[PDB]
Amino acid sequence: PGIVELPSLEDLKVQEVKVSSSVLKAAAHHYGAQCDKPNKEFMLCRWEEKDPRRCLEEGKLVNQCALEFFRQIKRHCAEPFTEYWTCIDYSGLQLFRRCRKEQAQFDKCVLDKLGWVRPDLGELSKVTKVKTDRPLPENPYHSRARPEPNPEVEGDLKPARHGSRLFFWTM
Amino acid sequence: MFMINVLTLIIPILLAVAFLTLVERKVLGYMQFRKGPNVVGPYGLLQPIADAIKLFIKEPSSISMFILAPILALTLALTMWIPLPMPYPLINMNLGVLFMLAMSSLAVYSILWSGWASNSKYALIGALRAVAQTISYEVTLAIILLSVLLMNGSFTLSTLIITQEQVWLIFPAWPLAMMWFISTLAETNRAPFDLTAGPFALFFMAEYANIIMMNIFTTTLFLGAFHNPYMPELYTINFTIKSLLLSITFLWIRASYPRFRYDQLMHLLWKNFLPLTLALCMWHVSLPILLSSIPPQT
Amino acid sequence: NVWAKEPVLVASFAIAGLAVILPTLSPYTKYSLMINRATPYNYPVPLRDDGNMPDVPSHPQDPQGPSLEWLKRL
Amino acid sequence: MMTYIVFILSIIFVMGFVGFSSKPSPIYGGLGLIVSGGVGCGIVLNFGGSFLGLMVFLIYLGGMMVVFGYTTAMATEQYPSNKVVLGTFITGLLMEFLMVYYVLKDKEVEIVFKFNGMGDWVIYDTGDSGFFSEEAMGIAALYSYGTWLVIVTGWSLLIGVVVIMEITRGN
Amino acid sequence: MSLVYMNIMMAFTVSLTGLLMYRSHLMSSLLCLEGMMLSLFILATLMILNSHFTLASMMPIILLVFAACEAALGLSLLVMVSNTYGTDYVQNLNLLQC
Amino acid sequence: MNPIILIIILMTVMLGTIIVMISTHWLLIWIGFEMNMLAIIPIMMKKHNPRATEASTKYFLTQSTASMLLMMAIIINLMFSGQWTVMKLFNPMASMLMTMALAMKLGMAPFHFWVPEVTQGIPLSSGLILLTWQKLAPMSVLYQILPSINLDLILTLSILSITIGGWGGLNQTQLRKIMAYSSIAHMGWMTAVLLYNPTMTLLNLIIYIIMTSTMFTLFMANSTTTTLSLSHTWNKAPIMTILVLITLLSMGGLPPLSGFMPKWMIIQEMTKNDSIILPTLMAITALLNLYFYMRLTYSTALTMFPSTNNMKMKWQFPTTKRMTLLPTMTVLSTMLLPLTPILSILE
Amino acid sequence: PFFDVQKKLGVDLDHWMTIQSAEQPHRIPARCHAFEKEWIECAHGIGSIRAEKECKIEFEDFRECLLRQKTMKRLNAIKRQRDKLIKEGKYTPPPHHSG
Amino acid sequence: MNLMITLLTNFTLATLLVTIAFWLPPFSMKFFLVAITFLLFDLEIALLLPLPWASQTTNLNTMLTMALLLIFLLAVSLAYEWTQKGLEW
Amino acid sequence: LLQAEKDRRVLQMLRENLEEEATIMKDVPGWKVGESVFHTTRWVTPMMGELYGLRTGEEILSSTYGFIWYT
């Protein structure tokens, strides 16, 4: 019965930050540090209104923020971040005890030329405030109101009427 | 390269078992005052290859069931070296220790099938008793396995090889390790836990591959080495040396002690191990909840 | 005495009894429960910011929110 | 070597069930049920399935048919097979192959259902971020929630022990 | 509709008929009951897997341990039957008439 | 057979039945039926004859296939609209096989072939506990999942069960088979009025369990199995015979006596629904299953059979059993005629 | 008899084994979570008969969520039409890999 | 299918070995206690074994208490047959 | 970011599959071109058949069966 409407490729023609996930995991704390403040706009939009085809322009927003962060880490300090991800690349599933020395060198890089202190464990937690330009939504489950409440029979009980009203044995 | 991985796994099992037979025969000979085999063949490797080809030569139930028993024993002996974490394991199975235990139970199935297949004899009643003394230890071995992985998060066994490389697991539980060792003595079905017919070479092969499986798993479970990455040969050499020494110690205990009585065996098992296992396992439950060190499953 | 009559059973009763009793006194029970509770498996959603609560910083680097420090302090 | 692998494993599962439900000698029946449990465990692991099907495999093909062969061996011999078993197996194969034809080269056969005719790689989840492998925490319940259930289960197991020993001549 | 459920229900019905019709020995019928147990196990398990009913996943393991101790009682009864007779027949039971 | 162990097993019977009562989850109801089976098996074979062996075997197979068919119905229920509440279900097939499994459970004319067999070769205490508790167990189930049942199932079961209990019963010589066939007929009655008012079903369950407790308590008071020993217990004890008179006529359900009240109120709330030929055909069958009651009462109390002596030797010795509670339950079971507006006890 | 130990002694021993929307150990939904929540709030204060009269919309929605019966019916209709018109042999398909 | 390929190769190698081999030429009741006793303790093992997958929750006292009740119940059963001449001969 | 990429990609597959259905069913009777099976207009999670239909083996076996029996 009910057909849908789905958006075209008019907004789905967007370049992506197509790097591997190993180097992205290597850039976890830092990308979570400076950027990823207005991606919680997208997160709040999605967990309030559970619609994809709703919050997609904020998907473009977080995509261009990650592109900004990647150009910033590309142009500025440094080059041995390349050494860092090719160090942590072949360690099966990545830990952070694996390539610690080059992690410390990249720390010294980012601290001396830009800043960006690594957040302490476990600060990447701790449910976080966000305000939007949109107002917070309403009735997101598309149904009507609940049709009939039970008519609550009230009033205290009257005494017994004509005894039992069975075949006999009144009282 | 997957079938070549299969070849590199299952080709050396034959040379491994035959050379294990010469090693156990020579080491029994030196535990005794017997040099040899060293006459025919240099240090007797021709002697096990002639044992294999001779027992293939010297050959004359319900032909279906008669084939179904040793084919099951041999395919378990082949297929159960897969999740072994010699440094990079063959298949990174998410859970393999209960897989080990279930296929030990399938080995018990193959033994029971041959016991029915031994054609209606007091021999087969003794084979049923052998099934009973085999099955009487998968309780204790599984509960000890549960305790020794209870300090290890999950079944994934690579997290186990992470936890082992700081200190060996023999020091958190040495008597539990010795009890598990006795359980492996009882499950591998050799001396002093005896006893009880073709093909003899294939059944021979299946039991010795079972023993090598348990030896490598034992050397895995309760010890280790510092694992420096991007060179697996270091841990491979050291793990192979300690598995050699553990298997030599296991034959060395197989050599020199008399067998048990059957009711002594059952009475010994239940009324000596099983409350002690329970007390050790409830202690292994109550320990990390009180020492604030529960293992972080990913 | 009572000891070497059935010795392994009595030893099992002793170690099992201390395994029962030992949770009733320990300096790490509440520490154990806090370390186990302080590990986020489920993802923390944000929310509509607040009506001015004395918590919940904007940057998680800001230590205004209730956080852990005894993870590093033994 | 095709896509309908769950369907074909289900076919061999029904094949084995017919192969011992045609009433053979009971040790051949136990052989057939071992093969049937093996292919059924293969089915549940091929839905993935990585935890539970191999988990309870030790209890069923690790605990049950051993004791069935035990109590079959020490009961009698049945040393003679009969045409009725072969006829029932042919009729079971007839029903199997007829369902195979009227499902594979047709649309649907309904006992009282509507079985849509295709191998079901779909439905299946869309790669959603578990990261805890839902089966694992699922069976790893009963200890923060399951108060009553383990109590009555252990109660029934204790009663099962004392019942077995009493009937087999307690004490 | 997940077409595999059709043949698992067909397998259930075949196992049910193998439970009910049986001529020679009680072990065959009890083994078909064990296969029916396995059928219900596997069917409910695939339901919980493909439905992602992740909260109450107690069903397969608890079903199997309970019907396991049921089967243990059945083996106790069959051993008692084989003791108080020579065999385990469907026959030799006409006493205690109806 | 230590008394501690038997008190334990009685506690498990109580616990299984209460888990059947209180649990709103289907798995725990299945667990309760299983645990009640596992507990009721060693109650039987209190002796070691092969009679109790075969009886417990047959009962084990019937209760086992009932449990398995119930688990099948629950799994089909969650293949359809799936919730673990004991509510109005959403499948004719699942409720269909579920009512068939409960017919295996409590016994119907499709499924009664095990009942006189298992009740013959057992002691009478085992027969009492199995009849009372295994007919009390499905009543909670039907009382909670009545609103989604095709009525033709339970109606055909009830009609056929009461007429099989009428026809089978006029030929037997064992008291155990007599009480078994009476249990068949009355469970057909107590299942017949499910989908109209379960109040009559539960109150008839109360009255029938009180009647069976009094009857089997009387037969615990004399280790008798046939009418011959009943006439010998006449010739040694007279008051037992007037008890047999009054209780058997209440099992007949006669209007001055209390057993007519569960019949008559069932006829009332079945004929306020405007089907008449079905209740009067069932009441013709309730006339039909009184003949064996009457000839039993004849051979016990009203006619007098000759007897062998050494009952003279027994006359010096008292009937020195202890009863659980015989006389109180008997006068509750028989003189309960003017307590008809105690129907209102339920809600 | 439906005793009220469950509603009287307060111990909710089985009010978590029942359906979802209770707190999972790791808080995830299943496929039909919103449909469960909507159907249950349609049939809360209802005597189960005008549930069948009124909540039939959400009932059929929940059932076609739980089975995808007509969904796979429509998908198989798509597959049969695709099979017969590729037996016809038109437009070597650029739904895959190309355009 | 990886495990299927390994199973296929090992099965075919086993059949090649067996074809090279064979194409180039009254009971005790006391026995019965062991199997069902084994199986019931294996069932209580199946009840115990999901604990190390579970041990990271908030309600830890409930976990510890029901774990204690499980091992203590297994101990009660074992001590029952121990005192009441069960595993004797 | 992986969530956002996943949502954009599955919406792209849905747009392409509606293009597929607009191409293929031009002659069938009935058939509104964009029927959701349900009633209420809410976003439903797709069933991997709507995401990957008519793929013939390769990518569906990689995206569904690869985790099941790989590694």
Tab-separated table of N, CA, C and O in Angstrom, chain C residues 6 9 20 23 33 36-37 41, chain H residues 55-58 60 64 68 82:
chain	number	residue	atom	x	y	z
C	6	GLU	N	40.589	-39.016	56.069
C	6	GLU	CA	40.298	-38.796	54.654
C	6	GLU	C	40.934	-37.460	54.297
C	6	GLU	O	40.252	-36.428	54.246
C	9	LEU	N	40.004	-34.949	51.203
C	9	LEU	CA	38.657	-34.411	51.335
C	9	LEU	C	38.620	-33.280	52.350
C	9	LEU	O	38.001	-32.243	52.098
C	20	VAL	N	34.674	-19.702	50.154
C	20	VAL	CA	33.366	-19.135	50.476
C	20	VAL	C	33.516	-17.876	51.321
C	20	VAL	O	32.880	-16.849	51.055
C	23	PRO	N	35.274	-13.836	50.111
C	23	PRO	CA	34.519	-12.658	49.646
C	23	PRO	C	33.894	-11.808	50.739
C	23	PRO	O	33.539	-10.658	50.455
C	33	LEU	N	34.176	-3.818	41.325
C	33	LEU	CA	32.910	-3.437	40.712
C	33	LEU	C	33.024	-2.108	39.974
C	33	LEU	O	32.426	-1.949	38.905
C	36	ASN	N	34.960	-2.766	36.695
C	36	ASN	CA	34.112	-3.451	35.726
C	36	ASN	C	33.030	-2.522	35.180
C	36	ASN	O	32.699	-2.583	33.990
C	37	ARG	N	32.488	-1.639	36.021
C	37	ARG	CA	31.442	-0.735	35.555
C	37	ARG	C	32.009	0.359	34.662
C	37	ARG	O	31.316	0.855	33.765
C	41	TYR	N	31.148	-0.512	26.826
C	41	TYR	CA	30.833	-1.374	25.690
C	41	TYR	C	29.768	-0.733	24.807
C	41	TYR	O	29.970	-0.562	23.601
H	55	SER	N	31.794	-12.897	32.874
H	55	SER	CA	32.328	-12.316	34.107
H	55	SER	C	32.527	-10.806	34.075
H	55	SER	O	33.048	-10.258	35.051
H	56	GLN	N	32.138	-10.123	33.012
H	56	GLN	CA	32.189	-8.671	32.936
H	56	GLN	C	30.753	-8.133	32.887
H	56	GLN	O	30.174	-7.903	31.824
H	57	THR	N	30.176	-7.948	34.071
H	57	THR	CA	28.859	-7.353	34.227
H	57	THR	C	28.894	-6.410	35.419
H	57	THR	O	29.919	-6.256	36.089
H	58	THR	N	27.759	-5.770	35.684
H	58	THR	CA	27.640	-4.918	36.857
H	58	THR	C	27.208	-5.711	38.083
H	58	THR	O	27.803	-5.576	39.156
H	60	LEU	N	27.720	-8.260	39.965
H	60	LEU	CA	28.763	-9.249	40.200
H	60	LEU	C	28.490	-10.114	41.417
H	60	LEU	O	28.889	-11.284	41.433
H	64	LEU	N	28.441	-14.158	41.423
H	64	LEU	CA	29.254	-14.920	42.362
H	64	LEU	C	28.388	-15.846	43.208
H	64	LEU	O	28.752	-17.004	43.436
H	68	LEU	N	28.435	-19.882	43.137
H	68	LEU	CA	28.591	-20.648	44.369
H	68	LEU	C	27.496	-21.688	44.529
H	68	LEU	O	27.763	-22.812	44.958
H	82	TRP	N	28.515	-40.148	47.358
H	82	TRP	CA	29.690	-40.524	48.131
H	82	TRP	C	29.295	-41.190	49.443
H	82	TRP	O	29.809	-42.260	49.790
